[PDB]
């Protein structure tokens, strides 16, 4: 019965991986800015 039932009756793409290691960062927001250096 299980074999008969199996034989008879049986999106949004991901973004690019952002990668940044050992890389200085500049942020720019509404009220403040950042400069993360090394």
């Amino acid at each position: 019965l299980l074999k008969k039932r199996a034989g008879k009756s049986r999106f949004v793409k991901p973004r690019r991986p952002y990668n940044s290691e050992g890389m200085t960062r500049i942020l720019r927001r509404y009220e403040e800015d950042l400069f993360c250096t090394f």
Partner: protein
């Protein structure tokens, strides 16, 4: 009228010390034949929100994310090298409404809409009060630009031919370049 090339030269300009007479006449011939090319560009105008720019220690490698928004649509992006070099010029302070042409690579700051209160008093900024744009963030547009055959020849001739547009250092472009340009 406009959009039609018109090369007006005298007789004495053919004799040159860098070019043969046939090369100068071939350049004068190819300056007068125009190619009108259509292009599909995208105009992105919106009030910017967060600008994240990631540069290396030497400052050569550059990548980052751009978060822009309008009244009805918020959308973050990804930045190339020329995009970051254009953003470093004409200083954006995270709240100035900008307009980006996708195919031309032109960054135009329309003005400031946020009207930031706390500001470091170092710049002489007197940016105009423009309004935050509403509607669709990304708009498709079809443009046409006119170039002539000599320009495409000099551009395809060598590595830095765009400088040879203006310096005139286009010395005897080979026949293979000309026939391949005709075929293309």
């Amino acid at each position: 009228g406009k959009d039609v090339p018109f090369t007006a030269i005298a007789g004495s300009e053919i004799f040159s010390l860098e070019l043969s007479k046939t090369e100068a006449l071939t350049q004068a011939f190819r300056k007068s034949i125009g190619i009108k090319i259509k292009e599909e560009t995208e105009l992105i105008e919106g009030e910017v929100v967060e600008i994240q720019i990631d540069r290396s220690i030497t400052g050569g490698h550059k990548q980052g994310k751009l978060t822009i928004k309008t009244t009805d649509m918020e959308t973050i992006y990804e930045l190339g090298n020329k995009m970051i070099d254009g953003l470093t010029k004409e200083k954006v302070l995270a709240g100035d409404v900008i307009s980006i042409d996708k195919a031309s690579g032109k960054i135009t700051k329309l003005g400031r809409s946020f009207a930031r209160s706390r500001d470091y008093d170092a710049m002489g900024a007197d940016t105009r009060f423009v309004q935050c744009p509403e509607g669709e963030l990304q708009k498709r547009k079809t443009v046409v630009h006119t170039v002539s055959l000599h320009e495409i020849d000099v551009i395809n001739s060598r590595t830095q031919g765009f400088l040879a547009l203006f310096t005139g250092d286009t010395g005897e472009i080979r026949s293979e370049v000309r026939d391949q340009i005709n075929t293309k």
